[PDB]
Design a protein around this nucleic acid. Structure first.
Lengths: 85, 95, 71, 98, 109, 95, 109, 82, 98
DNA sequence: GTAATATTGGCCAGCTAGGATCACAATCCCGGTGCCGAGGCCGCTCAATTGGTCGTAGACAGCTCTAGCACCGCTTAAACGCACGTACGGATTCCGTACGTGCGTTTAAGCGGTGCTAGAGCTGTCTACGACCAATTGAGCGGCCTCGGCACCGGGATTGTGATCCTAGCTGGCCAATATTAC
DNA sequence: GTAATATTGGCCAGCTAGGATCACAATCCCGGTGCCGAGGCCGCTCAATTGGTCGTAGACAGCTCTAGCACCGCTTAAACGCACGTACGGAATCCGTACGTGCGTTTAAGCGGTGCTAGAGCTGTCTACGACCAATTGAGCGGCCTCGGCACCGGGATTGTGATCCTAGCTGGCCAATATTAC
């Protein structure tokens, strides 16, 4: 029922980072960017998911709804429109 | 059963048909406009409420709205928004 | 070994249409086992004087910069 | 024999991925990763699909803006390549701890 | 004995709902009391912002030969307008993408 | 006549004498501490109120405070603040 | 017929005012109603933050041989603590100055 | 009326600010750029302060108006009674 | 004849102005400047002294933080000197229009 | 004074550039298709409206006196302008290799599908809890006094920096020894 | 082959790097001192407290059913790994000059002291306005239906890139025209 989903950060693969970066306009990328970005991403996610699970727990719910995520981002001053804000 | 959610969609569609009679709006975009309007509303209303207490004023009035609008919107946007809003309140007061 | 005798042997190591680079002289003299680390300025004066003699020639750059040839 | 010189196809794919809007992170790895992160704070947590999609849309916007600032830092160095030092600087200046 | 119904928004010559905004200022617990001209002025302000946005977005879509505006068009309208990009600068738009923006040095010579 | 300025100064002085009996406080720093307490207050109270409405709850209670504290303070600070606060509310409930 | 006065803060074993904070949550019109444990918990939280700050600031002042804390000491306490500098990171302190921070490359060799 | 006192933020004052910021060597163009930056900042802060003032039907800008202007800008300033 | 080599007294004054807290902008020029800015928005405006002092206090903190970020940008370039390009970059990355 | 050799300017030839040409991939475009989301219609409901009452927030007027402004004069630290020089930025060159690009290979995402059910979401009950109130009262505010912390001053001490000299080492040159040349 | 000379090696002189030392000035440390702000005391006030009432918000149980989760099996598309190679970053060098440093001169900031007014802040009156309630009603919601915009595609058309060929401009060597040296 509850899988142990460890070691997954490497699932954000090198080409996925390539295409996001490319969407950001960068042309040439050093091979060390990948680990740095994975670390950045784990940090960002940690903060967002902490805030979201908190907003969830308060409701006594055991499911994190999208309203919880948009409130968490909005709380971090990164408001996101289109998901029921 | 009857379940009611809140949106501005029809009002947005009205505005759109006033400005672009020959143009459509995807329900994805109407969910962003709805979120758009609610976020701008939350900023303006929060600033107006916040400003009234910071002025020891217990009421939100046209003044409180006017300075929150003037305060949030930058430059040429504020000048026109303020202008049409004053025009509208005058018309409403006259009515 | 005193400098200005290994630089000749180093520049003698190649024919290049725009001369041997300074990086080559550094690598060659290191391969001769010389303390190119500490004697760098001595090396620059030995080279510049020896091209100034015309025994060598500087053919691109200026000074120790660029590239060099035999007479 | 044909081989595009380095940097050309990169510019084409730049034009492409900027013209486009598709989510760029693969969906299942990102969902499993999200579950990884949430699992640390509490176990047996359930996610609506819209919520995971929101995390993904937000992550993509955050990293894209970070790469914008990073590319600006790299260009300022007069270096076309980005390196991690650029990321730590872009983040430190954004004010986030780095 | 009862006058013909005349919506406050029609009394103001607007499309945005005055009653709904009135409700939301009172039921938002912003203030215990709310003046009468505040909801009118506020609805007009929201009207102006939505009309500005929709004008720009429709321009972007017609420019892109799309007869219907979609989120990318909103992202274009926003980011191509200076004062809006200032107002919504800290904002991330769903499915918006990014402006086409290649820094000059990156182009080959 | 009668003019009233609000501060936390004496409470700050009490706390200070509890932690550093042999230390003083500049009036400048007590105006900073007063502003600091009011700022932290405003953040926490705003988040708790904002949360309750976002949860369709009309009341601020220990739960709303607990989640706002847990939200705003990062890590080891939150864990200890939460801990002492729970201890204090328990004592108050017992009393 | 009237019990001996016992302040809520003494009923909680605190120095911060429970009545004043209670007043502020009700008067600031945050919510129409306020539970009973909320002001207690909040006063305790404000207590913990002020005690943490004052501990660190007093340490800084004694470190600087100063028997009395002044704003520079607060700026030192804040910026030298990681989690506080995180909480008050976007904050500018009056007369605080800056941490002594010379980047290594700038020192001569 | 006052005019051209933006030069009042003199070269050594900019030098000392930079130094408090950890700056060691400075190019001579920094001065005009920083005067412009500073001009931008002030016109935003003062716009917000005069606005808060006008709203109170008041004709003097108090320190509390300045505090709230910065606090709106997300640069809250302690020490001034805020 | 005595002359400190360039950069030494600069580091001394760095240590100094970081140990210190005095306001760095001269008070009267800054007050007159503030009046110049306010005059554009409305005429005949009166300033409490505490209010002008607040503007000065805030400007010094803002420029100091800006110079922190700018010096980081300059050092990233591997250039000890700061130049205006550093300022436009630091500001553009802070997110303020520049 | 005159001529042969050498010197200098021009031409022909050779080398390198720039322009033109070609061939392929990527982009786009024009047009056809269906498909599904946008847009319209329907009888429902609660929210908007209307009208009348109460009371109270706030507009308004008047008074006080704080404090903001203006102005003068002096002293002096800070600003300014200039001279001077070092260290820096920046241009140049070169090199190694990390990236990029293009193959084949492998993986797992994605899709569609089925099955299961926890848990979201709503409803009803009811009571604990919080608002409100009057009477009570003591903590907290302002005013006043004071005395110890500390900023300043001056002398002595320490540290950091730049400038200088000394010594060992090495390189370059002369005389003597060896290798080469001559006897 | 042997000896003398000319080339090279050994000794001596000159130059540099590292180490040591001195000069000197910025900082620190220490006493003393006098100022004045922190801190305590007193008295007065109103906000906190107590106890009681009353209404209802929300805790709680119970039910529906949506939506989340899990597994399965094909189908590609994407990820992966590797070969090859070139554009890039980065080290090294050098040069010019822009800025730091320091000095002497000028300016105006700062103080402080005086005088004046406008505006900050408060109080009291009174009233327009908004909350509230009850009755009314129609705009908006969800559900159904429907059809045109658009995604996709298949097949041409247009463009961009990378590579090659030719004409051309520039530079070099030899010859032609001209100065320099020898007879």
């Amino acid at each position: 029922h509850r899988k142990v989903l460890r070691d997954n950060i490497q699932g954000i693969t090198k080409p996925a980072i390539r295409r996001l970066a490319r969407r950001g306009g960068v042309k040439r990328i050093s091979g060390l960017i990948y680990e740095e970005t994975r670390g950045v991403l784990k940090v960002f996610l940690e903060n967002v998911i902490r805030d979201a699970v908190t907003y969830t727990e308060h409701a006594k719910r055991k499911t994190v709804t999208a309203m919880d995520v948009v409130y968490a981002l909005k709380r971090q001053g990164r408001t996101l429109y289109g998901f029921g804000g | 059963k009857r379940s009611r959610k809140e949106s501005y969609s029809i009002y947005v569609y009205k505005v759109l048909k006033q400005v672009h009679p020959d143009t459509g709006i995807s329900s994805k975009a109407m969910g962003i406009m709805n979120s758009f309007v609610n976020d701008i509303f939350e900023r303006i209303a929060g600033e107006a409420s916040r400003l009234a207490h910071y002025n020891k004023r217990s009421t939100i009035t046209s003044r409180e709205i006017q300075t929150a609008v003037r305060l949030l919107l930058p430059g040429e946007l504020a000048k026109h928004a303020v202008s049409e809003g004053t025009k509208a309140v005058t018309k409403y007061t006259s009515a | 070994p005193p400098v200005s005798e290994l630089i000749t042997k180093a520049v003698a190591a190649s024919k290049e249409r725009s001369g041997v680079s300074l990086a080559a002289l550094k690598k060659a003299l290191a391969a001769a086992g010389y303390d190119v680390e500490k004697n760098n300025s001595r090396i620059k004066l030995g080279l510049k004087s020896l091209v100034s003699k015309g025994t060598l020639v500087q053919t691109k750059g200026t000074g120790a910069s660029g590239s060099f040839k035999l007479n | 024999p044909h081989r595009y010189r380095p940097g050309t196809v990169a510019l084409r794919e730049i034009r492409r991925y900027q013209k486009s809007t598709e989510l760029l992170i693969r969906k299942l790895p990102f969902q499993r990763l999200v579950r990884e992160i949430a699992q640390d704070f509490k176990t047996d947590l359930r996610f609506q699909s819209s919520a995971v999609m929101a995390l993904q849309e937000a992550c993509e916007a955050y990293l894209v803006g970070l790469f914008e600032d990073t590319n600006l830092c790299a260009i300022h160095a007069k270096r076309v390549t980005i390196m991690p030092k650029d990321i730590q600087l872009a983040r430190r200046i954004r004010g986030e701890r780095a | 004995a009862r006058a013909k119904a005349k919506t406050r928004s029609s009394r103001a010559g607007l499309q945005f709902p005055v009653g709904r905004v009135h409700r939301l200022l009172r039921k938002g617990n912003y203030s215990e009391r709310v003046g009468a001209g505040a909801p009118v002025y506020l609805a007009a302000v929201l009207e102006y912002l939505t009309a500005e946005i929709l004008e720009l977005a429709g321009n972007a879509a017609r420019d892109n030969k799309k007869t219907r505006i979609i989120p990318r068009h909103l992202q274009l309208a926003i980011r191509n307008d200076e004062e809006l990009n200032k107002l919504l600068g800290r904002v991330t738009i769903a499915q918006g993408g990014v402006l086409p923006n290649i820094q000059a040095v990156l182009l080959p010579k």
